[PDB]
């Protein structure tokens, strides 16, 4: 809950500043705040199985309808499984309990579908290096609204992908930063406090208000 509370305080602070009514948006850029991980792809098959996704390192995961999670590392071999009760286990495609067979199969189908048919969000973004403190995160929560899909990762990052104009936000409450991908697929990363200081355009402002609403929802559930 601490990640989301932080993010809520950060966003509330920036938004209360009315950053589009001030402009020096480029002064808010902090190139060292680029995220390590985001969701590059997703498939909502919640009608049947659940939500499959791919992170920018090409690792993949599924959050199944039964609230368990299966994660495949980008080595294409190592698996992490998380029961509904939180119990984690570590396995491989090569060595796994019979009980996981089905889910492993489903994960591979998701992988196929995503690899062949979908483009990568942030294809033009080199992710931050990242070190021993940043292990592979998994999808902790997700939902879709009238306007966007909201993806909350276990490292606290919250990603919001807007349906109409393909614009996207990746918020990190550890770095206190936001990456904005616009309709040109240009991306910039800002320190939220610096956005409080120098302000920003109307589009980013609006999307950060919507983001604050989404974080309140995530905190609410």
């Amino acid at each position: 809950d601490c990640h989301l509370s932080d993010m809520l305080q950060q966003l509330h602070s920036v938004n209360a500043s009315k950053p589009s009514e001030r402009v020096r948006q480029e002064e808010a850029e902090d190139p060292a705040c680029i995220p390590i991980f985001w969701v590059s792809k997703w498939v909502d098959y919640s009608d049947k199985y659940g939500l499959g996704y791919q992170l920018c390192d090409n690792s993949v995961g599924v959050l199944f309808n039964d609230s368990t999670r299966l994660i495949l590392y980008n080595d294409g071999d190592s698996l992490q499984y998380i029961e509904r009760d939180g119990t984690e286990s570590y396995l491989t495609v090569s060595s796994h309990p019979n009980s996981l067979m089905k889910k492993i199969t489903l994960l591979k189908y998701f992988r196929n579908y995503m690899s062949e048919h979908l483009l990568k969000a942030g294809a033009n973004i080199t992710p931050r290096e990242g070190d021993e403190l940043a292990r592979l995160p998994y999808l902790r929560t997700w939902f879709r609204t009238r306007s966007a899909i909201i993806l909350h990762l276990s490292n606290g990052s919250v990603q919001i992908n807007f349906f109409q104009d393909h614009t996207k936000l990746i918020l990190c409450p550890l770095m206190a930063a936001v990456t904005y991908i616009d309709e040109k697929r240009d991306f910039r990363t800002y320190r939220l406090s610096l956005l409080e200081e120098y302000g920003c355009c109307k589009e980013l402002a609006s999307r950060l208000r919507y983001a604050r609403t989404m974080v309140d929802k995530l905190l609410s559930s």
Binding site: V43, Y45, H117, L118, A121, F163, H166
Partner: peptide, 8 residues
């Protein structure tokens, strides 16, 4: 109402 993220 997309089934998935932005396709190729």
């Amino acid at each position: 109402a997309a089934f998935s993220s932005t396709p190729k």
